[PDB]
Design a protein around this ligand. Sequence first.
Ligand SMILES: *[C@@H]1O[C@H](CO[C@@H]2O[C@@H](C)[C@@H](O)[C@@H](O)[C@@H]2O)[C@@H](O[C@@H]2O[C@H](CO)[C@@H](O[C@@H]3O[C@H](CO[C@H]4O[C@H](CO)[C@@H](O)[C@H](O)[C@@H]4O)[C@@H](O)[C@H](O[C@H]4O[C@H](CO)[C@@H](O)[C@H](O)[C@@H]4O)[C@@H]3O)[C@H](O)[C@H]2NC(C)=O)[C@H](O)[C@H]1NC(C)=O
Ligand SMILES: CCCCCCCCCCCCCCCCCCCC(=O)N[C@@H](CO[C@H]1O[C@H](CO)[C@H](O)[C@H](O)[C@H]1O)[C@H](O)[C@H](O)CCCC(=O)NCCCCCCc1ccccc1
Ligand SMILES: *[C@@H]1O[C@H](CO)[C@@H](O)[C@H](O)[C@H]1NC(C)=O
Ligand SMILES: *[C@@H]1O[C@H](CO)[C@@H](O)[C@H](O)[C@H]1NC(C)=O
Ligand code: NA
Ligand code: NA
Lengths: 264, 98
Amino acid sequence: NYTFRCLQMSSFANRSWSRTDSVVWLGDLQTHRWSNDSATISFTKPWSQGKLSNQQWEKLQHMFQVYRVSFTRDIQELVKMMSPKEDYPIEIQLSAGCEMYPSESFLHVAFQGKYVVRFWGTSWQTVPGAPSWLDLPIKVLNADQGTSATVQMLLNDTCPLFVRGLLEAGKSDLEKQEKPVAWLSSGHRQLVCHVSGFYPKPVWVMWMRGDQEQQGTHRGDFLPNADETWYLQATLDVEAGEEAGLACRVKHSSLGGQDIILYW
Amino acid sequence: QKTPQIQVYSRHPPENGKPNILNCYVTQFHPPHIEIQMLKNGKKIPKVEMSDMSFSKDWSFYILAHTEFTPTETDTYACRVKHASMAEPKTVYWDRDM
Ligand SMILES: *[C@@H]1O[C@H](CO[C@@H]2O[C@@H](C)[C@@H](O)[C@@H](O)[C@@H]2O)[C@@H](O[C@@H]2O[C@H](CO)[C@@H](O[C@@H]3O[C@H](CO[C@H]4O[C@H](CO)[C@@H](O)[C@H](O)[C@@H]4O)[C@@H](O)[C@H](O[C@H]4O[C@H](CO)[C@@H](O)[C@H](O)[C@@H]4O)[C@@H]3O)[C@H](O)[C@H]2NC(C)=O)[C@H](O)[C@H]1NC(C)=O
Ligand SMILES: CCCCCCCCCCCCCCCCCCCC(=O)N[C@@H](CO[C@H]1O[C@H](CO)[C@H](O)[C@H](O)[C@H]1O)[C@H](O)[C@H](O)CCCC(=O)NCCCCCCc1ccccc1
Ligand SMILES: *[C@@H]1O[C@H](CO)[C@@H](O)[C@H](O)[C@H]1NC(C)=O
Ligand SMILES: *[C@@H]1O[C@H](CO)[C@@H](O)[C@H](O)[C@H]1NC(C)=O
Ligand code: NA
Ligand code: NA
C-alpha cells in the first residue's frame, strides 16, 4: 500500500512575482524535486526515472514544463479578470498521484490553504463550500478537451504505470531496514523513552514493568530525521520511587526479533 | 493563516563531547514563507541544512532543518522561527534530553 504524491506549491505575491516549486513522494521517501529555479525535474534517488526510457522521461518532463508556464499564465490572467475582488497574495497547492493496491488516483487543489477543486472522472469540479467565483473558470477549463484528455491519461494510466516502475527500480531503498537507537530521560516525574533512526515507519514502543505493559504510555508524533529514518518518543507519568523496575521496550522489523530493552 | 509548531530533537543519544545532529522540525504553518534559524548560545549557526518545503494532507506546510552539533553542559541550542502569523520570532530551546 504505497501512495505516490506530487505536491505543487505556487505563491503569487503580486502581478510581477510568483514561484512554483514541487516535491514528489513515494510513500515517505522523496523521489523528486522541481524548483522554480530549475527547467528540469531533479532526481532525489538513483531510481527516480522508474522504468522510463530517456526519451519517454524527456516527453513527460516537457509536458510538465509546458504545464508550469501555462498554469502561471492562467492564474495571473484570472486575477486580472477578477480584480479587485480576488487580490494578491495567493497560495495555490496541488496534490496529485495514485495509491497502489495489489490503483486509484486523485488530483486535489487548494486555494489559501483550503481544498476547493478536484479532477474526478472526466472533468474538473469545485467541491461543496468552495467560493462561487471559481465556478465560471472551472467551466471554461472543462471546455478544454485536450487538457481533460491529458489529465485523464496521466491519472488513470501514466501514474500507476510509472509507479510500478519505481517500486521495481527502487526495491532495495523501499525495503531498507534501519535499526533504531534508544535512550531514556526525564510533584510527579515524566519518564521519556527516545527511539531514533528506525526505518520503515511501523514500530512498537512501550513502558514495561516486567511483562506488564504500562497503559499510561503516551506515544508522541513520528518526527523525521534528515537521513530518511524516523524519531519517536513514548512518555510515562509516574510518582517518585516507582521508577525502579520500569523499562522501555522497543520492537522493530530491523531488529531480527531481538528487542531493545532499556531499564531505568 | 496558521502558526508554526516547533520541535527540537537529536539524531543520536546526546552524549557530551560526542558529535551529533540537531533537528528542528517546523510544522502546521501557512503561508509557506518562513525564516528558520538554529542557535548555539543565542548566536546563529552558519551551515544549517534545510529539507525541501512540503505539505501534509491538511495542506499545512512543514520543513526540517538540521545541523551538526556536539552537546556539552556549557552550550545551549535553540530553533528560532519568524513567520507572518506571529508578531515576533518564536524560539524553542533544545530540552537537552530530546
Ligand atoms: C479515467 O477514469 C475515470 C473514473 O475513475 C475516477 O476518476 C479518475 C480521474 C481517478 O480519480 C480514479 O481514481 C477515479 O476512480 C473515468 O471517468 C468515468 O468516465 C465515464 C465516461 O468516460 C463516465 O461514464 C458516464 O457516467 C455517467 C453517469 O455519471 C454519474 O453516475 C455514476 C454512477 O452511475 C457516477 O459514477 C458518476 O460520478 C456520476 O454521478 C453516464 O450518464 C454516462 O452515460 C452516457 O454516456 C455514455 C457514453 O459515455 C452513453 O453510451 C450512455 O448511453 C449515456 O448517454 C457515462 O456512462 C463515468 O461517470 C466517469 N466516472 C466518474 C466517477 O465520473 C474516465 O473516463 C477515465 N478516462 C480515461 C481516458 O481512461
Ligand atoms: C512531477 C513528477 C511527475 C511524474 C509523472 C507521474 C504522473 C503524475 C500524474 C499526476 C500529475 C497531475 C498533473 C496535473 C496538471 C497537468 C495539466 C496537463 C495539461 C496541460 O498542460 N494543459 C495546458 C496546455 O495548454 C494547451 O494545450 C492543451 C493540449 O495539451 C489544450 O488543448 C489547451 O487548449 C492549450 O491551451 C493548458 O494551458 C491548461 O490550461 C494548463 C493549466 C490548466 C490547469 O491545469 N490549471 C490548474 C488546475 C485548475 C485548478 C486551479 C483552480 C484555482 C485555485 C485557486 C484559485 C483560482 C483557481
Ligand atoms: C512583489 O513581491 C515580492 C515578494 O513579496 C517583493 O520582493 C516585491 O516588493 C513586490 N514587487 C512589487 C512590484 O510589488
Ligand atoms: C520562477 O520561474 C519563472 C520562470 O523561469 C521566473 O520567470 C520567475 O521569476 C521565477 N520566480 C522567482 C521568484 O524567482
Ligand atoms: Na493553498
Ligand atoms: Na496550508
